[PDB]
Structure formats: structure tokens, C-alpha cells
Amino acid sequence: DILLTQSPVILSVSPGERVSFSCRASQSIGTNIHWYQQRTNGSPRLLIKYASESISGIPSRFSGSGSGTDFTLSINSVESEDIADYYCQQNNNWPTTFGAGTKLELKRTVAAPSVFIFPPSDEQLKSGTASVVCLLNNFYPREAKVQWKVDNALQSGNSQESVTEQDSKDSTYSLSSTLTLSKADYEKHKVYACEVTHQGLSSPVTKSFNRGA
Amino acid sequence: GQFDLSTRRLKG
Amino acid sequence: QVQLKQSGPGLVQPSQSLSITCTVSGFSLTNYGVHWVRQSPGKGLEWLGVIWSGGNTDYNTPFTSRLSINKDNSKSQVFFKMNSLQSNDTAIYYCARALTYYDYEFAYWGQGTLVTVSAASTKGPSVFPLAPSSGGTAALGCLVKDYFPEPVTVSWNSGALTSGVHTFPAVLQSSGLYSLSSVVTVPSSSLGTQTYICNVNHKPSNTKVDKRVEPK
Numbered sequence: 001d002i003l004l005t006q007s008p009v010i011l012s013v014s015p016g017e018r019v020s021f022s023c024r025a026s027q028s029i030g031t032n033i034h035w036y037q038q039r040t041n042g043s044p045r046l047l048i049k050y051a052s053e054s055i056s057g058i059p060s061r062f063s064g065s066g067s068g069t070d071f072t073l074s075i076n077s078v079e080s081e082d083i084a085d086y087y088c089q090q091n092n093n094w095p096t097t098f099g100a101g102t103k104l105e106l107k108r109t110v111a112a113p114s115v116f117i118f119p120p121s122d123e124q125l126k127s128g129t130a131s132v133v134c135l136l137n138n139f140y141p142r143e144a145k146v147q148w149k150v151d152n153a154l155q156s157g158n159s160q161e162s163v164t165e166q167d168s169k170d171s172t173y174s175l176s177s178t179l180t181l182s183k184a185d186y187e188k189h190k191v192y193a194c195e196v197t198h199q200g201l202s203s204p205v206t207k208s209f210n211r212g213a
Numbered sequence: 214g215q216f217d218l219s220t221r222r223l224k225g
Numbered sequence: 226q227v228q229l230k231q232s233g234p235g236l237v238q239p240s241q242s243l244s245i246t247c248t249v250s251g252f253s254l255t256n257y258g259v260h261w262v263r264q265s266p267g268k269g270l271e272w273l274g275v276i277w278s279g280g281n282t283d284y285n286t287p288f289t290s291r292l293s294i295n296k297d298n299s300k301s302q303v304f305f306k307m308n309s310l311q312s313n314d315t316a317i318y319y320c321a322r323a324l325t326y327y328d329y330e331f332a333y334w335g336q337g338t339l340v341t342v343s344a345a346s347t348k349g350p351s352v353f354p355l356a357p358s359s360g361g362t363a364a365l366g367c368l369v370k371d372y373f374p375e376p377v378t379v380s381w382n383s384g385a386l387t388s389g390v391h392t393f394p395a396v397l398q399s400s401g402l403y404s405l406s407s408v409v410t411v412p413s414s415s416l417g418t419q420t421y422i423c424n425v426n427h428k429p430s431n432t433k434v435d436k437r438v439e440p441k
């Protein structure tokens with residue numbers, strides 16, 4: 001099988017800049033290479049066929065070149081909607097094979113998160129489990145810290161984080177931090193606090209509630 | 214570098 | 226309008242077999258081959274096989290003995306079947322169609338079918354409100370907890386509300402069950418006028434829940 005090597009693993013640029021993806025084949029494949037774009041939760045989308053040929057409905061800022069073993073996919077002026085992974089495919093030799101992909105990330109100005117805290121619903125408390133959710137919305141860059149405190153006690157190991165991929169329009173991330181307690185433990189305490197640290201904040205922001213009001 | 218089934222995106 | 230629509234995601238027990246149906250429209254199976262491609266954490270994008278216009282099939286080498294592709298031209302359906310699945314067969318499976326009838330330039334894809342190979346059992350989620358509470362922008366959401374396997378679809382107000390929506394990637398709990406939240410930001414002034422419903426659908430368990438989310 002032909003081995004296709006894509007580089008780099010991750011690309012990070014600013015909007016309006018040009019960007020290139022490399023795809024190298026373990027042996028000559030003429031111009032028999034195709035390129036695909038994969039957005040978050042999407043199926044692959046065909047960008048270029050046979051190294052350089054246009055595809056209907058694909059914006060003109062996408063192009064490709066190369067022959068033999070060294071191939072290049074280019075975006076001459078990147079837009080936020082280009083946030084995706086990019087794969088090459090060879091079909092000079094059976095079976096057709098794909099590269100491992102390059103990730104394209106977009107830079108943008110620092111944006112501080114908007115922080116919200118959600119107490120557990122009474123509905124969930126009926127089940128014997130309490131979930132406390134802290135939301136960090138529309139921020140950049142991705143790095144952030146969530147510190148949980150229950151009655152001034154540092155919580156450790158009983159929370160989980162999930163981060164969205166970059167937004168295709170404003171290039172921000174959003175983060176959810178979920179603190180899970182047994183209903184018994186939740187009823188034995190009062191002050192539930194989420195503390196958020198981020199480059200866009202001059203001070204850590206704390207959202208809290210007292211069980212009840 | 215690996216495909217993540219939750220997001221259909223490359224992660225590490 | 227060329228389209229390919231696959232059957233729903235689901236669970237297959239280890240050593241058991243996988244069946245996916247690909248229904249096409251906008252073209253005829255008698256004029257085009259239909260390819261099958263999967264995408265897994267282990268091996269990334271992986272071409273599995275193809276059934277050509279005239280009924281012939283090609284299978285990628287490591288799948289010759291456990292792969293079977295059939296079709297019904299009249300019904301515009303292609304049937305994919307793979308035997309003896311193991312854990313690393315967990316992947317998203319796509320059917321795809323090339324630009325020309327003989328080629329491999331995949332310009333049209335199905336929406337994909339996430340197949341989870343596990344011995345565990347299907348479990349529907351519980352949906353809990355993330356209620357807004359007291360700069361004119363309120364955040365609210367739904368907690369979609371304790372389901373298996375992936376995935377679950379979440380939308381807001383039956384598709385009418387998409388702006389400001391964030392549906393977070395699911396996370397695996399120590400219980401072996403998944404959980405996720407879906408949030409949305411809206412104007413505070415609309416909380417007394419507009420209804421906010423998250424529409425949750427866990428196809429592997431046929432669990433559909435509409436959860437109204439109100440200020441408490």
C-alpha cells in the first residue's frame with residue numbers, strides 16, 4: 001500500500017493569511033491525489049481532484065499542485081469557516097489510501113469567557129445524583145482553569161471538562177465543567193463556587209450559589 | 214493526531 | 226440532487242455482525258458504483274470496498290473474508306455487512322459515490338453511521354434542565370446524562386433555534402456511560418415570552434425527549 005504522510009500535524013494561522021498543506025507519498029503516484037475537508041461532526045468534503053483540478057461549488061481560494069511524491073493544498077486567504085481537518089487521498093495504486101490529516105486552527109484576538117453556573121435541578125436530585133455545571137462561553141485562547149470549591153474546600157477529581165471545537169464564525173471556544181456529587185454529599189453543604197482563570201481576565205472570575213438561594 | 218469519534222475531528 | 230442516506234447508529238456485540246443500509250437518490254445504482262469508507266481512531270480513513278454498477282464487488286485486502294456488499298437497484302439501496310467485529314472495528318462508516326462511474330473521487334458522502342462494538346447494553350439518557358437565573362444575556366441548557374452508546378442528537382426549538390447553541394462533546398463517565406450538555410444564550414427579555422425546548426434523540430435506544438427549560 002502507498003503510505004501518505006501529511007505535515008504538519010497542526011497548522012495555526014491568522015485570517016487572511018495564506019496556508020499550505022503538504023502530502024508526501026512513499027512512491028511516485030503521478031498526479032493521482034485528491035483532497036478532502038472535514039468540519040466538526042461532518043462528512044469529508046471533496047476539495048481538489050487529481051492534484052490541481054477544481055471541484056464544483058468549492059471556493060476559488062482552494063487550490064492544489066504537485067506531482068510525483070510531493071503535493072500541496074493551498075488556501076490563499078484563510079477564513080474562519082476553513083477551520084477543519086484536511087486529508088489527502090491517492091488512487092494511483094490499489095487500494096486507494098488516505099493520509100492521517102492536518103488540523104487547521106485559526107488565531108484571533110484574546111476574548112474573555114462569560115461565566116455561568118447552574119445548580120442541579122430538583123428533577124436530577126430525585127435520582128440521587130447532583131450535577132453542578134459551570135459554563136465558560138465564547139473565549140480565546142483555549143487554555144483556561146476551572147477550580148471548584150464547596151464550603152471553601154477544594155474539589156479535586158470529581159469534575160469533568162468538555163471543550164467545543166472552534167466556532168466557524170467567531171473562532172472562539174466554549175467550555176463546560178461538570179461537578180458530580182452524590183445527593184447526600186450535596187445536601188451536606190451550602191456554598192458551591194466555580195472559579196475561572198483565563199488570559200482575558202485581569203482577575204479570576206467566581207460564580208457561586210448557595211443551595212436554596 | 215487521532216480521529217475522535219465524538220467530534221469527527223483530529224485530537225492529538 | 227445527489228444524496229446518500231444511511232441507517233441509524235447503533236451497538237454491535239463483539240464477534241457479531243454489522244449491517245448498514247445506504248439509500249441513494251438523484252442517480253441510479255445501475256449507473257454508479259457505491260463505495261464504503263470507515264473512519265476509526267486506530268487507522269483513520271480506510272477504504273473498505275465497492276459494489277459496481279453491474280453488481281461486481283471489490284473488497285480491500287484485510288476485509289475479503291468478512292465483508293459482503295449487496296444492493297437492490299429497484300429500491301436504490303446498498304447493503305453493507307461485516308462479520309465478527311471486535312473493539313477496534315468501532316468507527317464511523319460512510320457510503321460514498323465517485324464523480325464518474327469508474328473512479329474513486331468521492332464527491333458525495335452519506336452522513337455516516339457510528340458503530341460501537343461493545344458487550345454492554347444500550348441505555349437511553351436522562352435529560353435535565355440547566356435553568357437560567359438572575360448584561361441582558363441569559364444562558365440556559367440541557368444536561369443529557371447516562372446514555373450508551375454514542376451518539377445523541379440535540380437541537381433547540383425543533384431546529385428553529387441554532388444561533389448561540391453549543392453542544393459539548395460527550396464525555397465517558399466512570400460508570401461507562403456518556404454525558405453531555407447543550408447550552409444556548411438568549412436575551413433575558415425573551416425568557417417570559419419565548420419557550421425554550423431542547424430536542425434530544427438517542428437513536429440507538431429509540432429515546433426521544435423534549436425538555437422544556439424555564440427559569441426556576
